[PDB]
């Protein structure tokens, strides 16, 4: 039967959906209800079966684990960097083309301005050359040489083909969480989504 | 300075930011802001400057023009066929694994659901073995070989590594629009912006 199962966009286009095809290899008799949204469905409200959250859930009446910890890094595509050349702090952004999410970004997207912020006051922010609220068209347009972008890291991948970027700073790093009702906690088709998806995060040493 | 456009999350992933690629090579004093929504911003309330819309505007106030129109298609990956075989007909499908969008869908994207519905009444809809509501990720669906999919040919592109399945069916094509409000019309920046995209859209023969 059908699992319907909730999370961002970015998550569920970068990560979510190549899984997604790796549990159906497994489980053919079941199938699998994506919706992708950056407003929080709530799954209490039979929206969804389950979620996956960028930040730990709060409703004290879902069960959840975490899974992974996401990392923000810095990246340009060699074609930038071949005719811009490479900055080397976060000051040298300054002469340099980025490309950020713009506003209104998702309360719990954390740091997807990163780029237009750092170092700077919150009156004298940078103009972004381009802006994208869309995680995946953000690595498209950094992979065609648009800019330099800041990026999580399930987004960017294993193989890339973009440069990590070592501005010499820190951007915070986030907690992801799978999560689900105590009505679903029985559910065959949950337990085995769950436990699937638990052990894939595991082992997604980026 | 700075140009608003918003579209849907399909169009806006699928085929406008490799076009804005091209268009800030032309004109890099310019910025671009895409906003990718499925729900229509209202350009009139300055959300945007401007948007590219998946039916013809119906409000008075807006200049708009046609661009190009879009075919929807239904297509399989190799390593599907390779071991599903391929279907010859509409009915087949019922032994076959379809990738949808699912519900709910807003109600000027057509046909995103045609694989449940085609040949059957709307009390009996084939049971998709997938559904994401997200454009670009049922095409990344596909080509990992999870299902069939029907898909717009701005999603698959003009080499889509997709077999295009003829299952002796037409599916209803729709024709895209530029619109921005006249109070926009006298904006060097968007006749720059307006005038690059319906050249492009005229070259978009697919």
Same mark, same amino acid.
């Given at each position: 039967?059908?699992?319907?199962?909730?999370?961002?966009?970015?998550?569920?286009?970068?990560?979510?959906?190549?899984?997604?095809?790796? @549990?159906?290899?497994?489980?053919?008799?079941?199938?699998?209800?994506?919706?992708?949204?950056?407003?929080?469905?709530?799954?209490?409200?039979?929206?969804?079966?389950?979620?996956?959250?960028?930040?730990?859930?709060? $409703?004290?009446?879902?069960?959840?684990?975490?899974?992974?910890?996401?990392?923000?890094?810095?990246?340009?595509?060699?074609?930038?960097?071949?005719?811009?050349?490479?900055?080397?702090?976060?000051?040298?952004?300054?002469?340099?083309?980025?490309?950020?999410?713009?506003?209104?970004?998702?309360?719990?997207?954390?740091?997807?301005?990163?780029?237009?912020?750092?170092?700077?006051?919150?009156?004298?922010? =940078?103009?972004?050359?381009?802006?994208?609220?869309?995680?995946?068209?953000?690595?498209?347009?950094?992979?065609?040489?648009?800019?330099?972008?800041?990026?999580?890291?399930?987004?960017?991948? =294993?193989?890339?083909?973009?440069? $990590?970027?070592?501005?010499?700073?820190?951007?915070?790093?986030?907690?992801?969480?799978?999560?689900?009702?105590?009505?679903?906690?029985?559910?065959?088709?949950?337990?085995?989504?769950?436990? @699937?998806?638990?052990?894939?995060?595991?082992?997604?040493?980026?």
């Amino acid at each position: 039967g059908k699992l319907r199962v909730t999370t961002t966009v970015g998550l569920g286009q970068g990560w979510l959906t190549d899984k997604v095809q790796e @549990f159906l290899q497994l489980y053919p008799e079941m199938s699998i209800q994506l919706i992708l949204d950056n407003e929080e469905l709530d799954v209490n409200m039979r929206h969804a079966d389950c979620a996956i959250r960028l930040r730990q859930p709060q $409703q004290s009446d879902l069960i959840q684990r975490k899974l992974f910890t996401v990392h923000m890094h810095v990246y340009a595509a060699p074609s930038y960097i071949n005719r811009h050349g490479e900055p080397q702090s976060v000051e040298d952004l300054d002469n340099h083309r980025i490309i950020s999410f713009g506003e209104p970004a998702p309360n719990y997207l954390l740091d997807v301005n990163w780029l237009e912020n750092a170092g700077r006051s919150s009156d004298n922010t =940078r103009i972004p050359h381009l802006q994208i609220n869309s995680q995946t068209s953000i690595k498209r347009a950094c992979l065609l040489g648009i800019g330099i972008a800041c990026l999580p890291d399930y987004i960017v991948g =294993r193989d890339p083909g973009l440069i $990590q970027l070592s501005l010499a700073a820190d951007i915070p790093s986030f907690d992801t969480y799978f999560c689900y009702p105590d009505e679903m906690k029985n559910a065959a088709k949950l337990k085995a989504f769950r436990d @699937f998806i638990v052990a894939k995060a595991r082992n997604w040493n980026f």
